[PDB]
């Protein structure tokens, strides 16, 4: 019993982390097969970040300007190329610990584990989510660019995020493993600011189903509602729309607990209109939205990754 | 910037997890060199747990009664010995992925990472603290015994917890890796209950400092307080007594923020007497007490000018 914010096992990702040094800038790299991936702003300084011309700055750089360290071992860069906002550094040796992996671009509301790294050495792992405004509420200090976010999909490591920048409000922005920034952010030190962040509705409902599995039933009511009636109320509380596909994804948790998805929406509407009244749900005094439906099934069923 | 419940990388611990089966019971074991450590209650039947004589029960066991599996490969057991409540199974193969490790016994109020496992395979990694009543609020299902808690100091893994039981209130009890239980619990199916649990005051203060570092300041005040006068209020709200040892530990955090330790106690005092008034601190609507000062400095320390 019990319910906790839980990250994925980081073992297969630790064996892929690498240090990449360029001139006077140092960050982290992802070593998969014979290719190292890292943010492209490693070739620039703090002065260049105000408006960097990445094309002309990479023309000046050569293969010997890229120092890649795999722990206490130096790697030999034999090729380099830029794809959007990341660099692909071809090395002469394949990582022996290379796991079965994919590159995926996640939708807003999806959760993942972040292996925060510094100088190519992992120091921590935590579970966060891609916010609706395409930011993440991570924990990163200076020098953590190149850290990766990932899911474990059955037998495969699903890389979905690489950390790049910190925004003025304290949140973070980054790219997928193809160099494309999530949202309208760029790798330039400017005045870009995140929009208003909303609550991931389908995750709150999955979290409420987790509370029912673990014994909490005080928020259930004898009310009921439709999708439009619920969406119109949650809209004024900055909640994301609940699609008909989201109702289908919550199907398994609705059938296991015997509570209709629309009945659970009626419960959430009361909590939005009346609050928690100082009460707690699964050890939290507010509504948690960083648990996807499958995240609930993994913890409650003890899903293991071999 | 930002603050997250962050666990240590679990790669060095995953490579030590194995599956131990005796009779109809299956749980997890720790594979270090040529020894497998696991809870000794794996050798008991349901009738034995009522009043077990572990000395008498282990002598009756043969080596082939234990089936140890590293992945899908059987580990040949060649001997068994008992140290307190931990069974030590000698195997014929030394674990080639054994990391630098030590066995440590933590104090109440400290934190560690838990690698929750089932059938020798990891399910997830999360953080928790040793409650003042010598329990942990984990997320454990049937089959999770043998999962270990741990910290990492650079390259060395300090094992500090092995899971054994769940108490009637839903919290969990276990031992260090030498087999000594935390608290007055025993590995016998008898009537047991967790003591009165208090809030770890020094951890809440460390968490309030983390909020100051990240920009939150609404809870501060001009007031000050002494050690005695604060402990008068802390005792009234089921908080652990703050001591000079705790004050000295919060030293670096007090200097980094310029807020004296006793000044932050006057802010925590006001929060306990008035509540949070509906506002949040670092994403929580209640006071968090499972972040040690070390955990805060680990995520929030920059550079100290002297």
UniProtKB/Swiss-Prot annotation, chains A, B:
It catalyses: TSAVLQ-|-SGFRK-NH2 and SGVTFQ-|-GKFKK the two peptides corresponding to the two self-cleavage sites of the SARS 3C-like proteinase are the two most reactive peptide substrates. The enzyme exhibits a strong preference for substrates containing Gln at P1 position and Leu at P2 position. The chain holds residues 3264 to 3569 of 7096 of the full protein. It comes from Severe acute respiratory syndrome coronavirus 2. It is found in: Host cytoplasm; Host Golgi apparatus; Host nucleus. Residues 1-306 are cytoplasmic. This is 3C-like proteinase nsp5. Changing residue 189 to A: Does not affect ability to cleave and inactivate human TRMT1. The active site is at 41 (for 3cl-pro activity), 145 (nucleophile). Inhibited by pyridone-containing alpha-ketoamides compounds 13a and 13b. In turn, alpha-ketoamide 13b (tert-butyl (1-((S)-1-(((S)-4-(benzylamino)-3,4-dioxo-1-((S)-2-oxopyrrolidin-3-yl)butan-2-yl)amino)-3-cyclopropyl-1-oxopropan-2-yl)-2-oxo-1,2-dihydropyridin-3-yl)carbamate) inhibits SARS-CoV-2 replication in human lung cells. Inhibited ex vivo by michael acceptor inhibitor N3. Inhibited ex vivo by compound 11a and 11b. Residues 1-306 form the Peptidase C30 domain.
């Amino acid at each position: 019993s019990g319910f906790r914010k839980m990250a994925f096992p980081s073992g297969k990702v630790e064996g892929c982390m690498v240090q990449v040094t360029c001139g006077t800038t140092t960050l982290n790299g992802l070593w998969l097969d014979d290719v190292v991936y890292c943010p492209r702003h490693v070739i620039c300084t703090s002065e260049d970040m105000l408006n960097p011309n990445y094309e002309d700055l990479l023309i000046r750089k050569s293969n010997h300007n890229f120092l890649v360290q795999a722990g206490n071992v130096q790697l030999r860069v034999i090729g380099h190329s830029m794809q959007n906002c990341v660099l692909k550094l071809k090395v002469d040796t394949a990582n022996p610990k290379t796991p079965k992996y994919k590159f995926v671009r996640i939708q807003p509301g999806q959760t993942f584990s972040v292996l925060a790294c510094y100088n190519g050495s992992p120091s921590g792992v935590y579970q966060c989510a891609m916010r609706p405004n395409f930011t993440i509420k991570g924990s990163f200090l200076n020098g953590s660019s190149g850290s990766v976010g990932f899911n474990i999909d059955y037998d495969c490591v699903s890389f979905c995020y690489m950390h790049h920048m910190e925004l003025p409000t304290g949140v973070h922005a980054g790219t997928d493993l193809e160099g494309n920034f999530y949202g309208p952010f760029v790798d330039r030190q400017t005045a870009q600011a995140a929009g208003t962040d909303t609550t991931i509705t389908v995750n709150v409902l999955a979290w409420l189903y987790a509370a029912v599995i673990n014994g909490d039933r005080w928020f259930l009511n004898r009310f009921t509602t439709t999708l439009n009636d619920f969406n119109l109320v949650a809209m004024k509380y900055n909640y994301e729309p609940l699609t008909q596909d989201h109702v289908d994804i919550l199907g398994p948790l609705s059938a296991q607990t015997g509570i209709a998805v629309l009945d659970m929406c009626a419960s959430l509407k009361e909590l939005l209109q009346n609050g928690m009244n100082g009460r707690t749900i699964l050890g939290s005094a507010l509504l948690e939205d960083e648990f996807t439906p499958f995240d609930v099934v993994r913890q409650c069923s003890g899903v293991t990754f071999q």
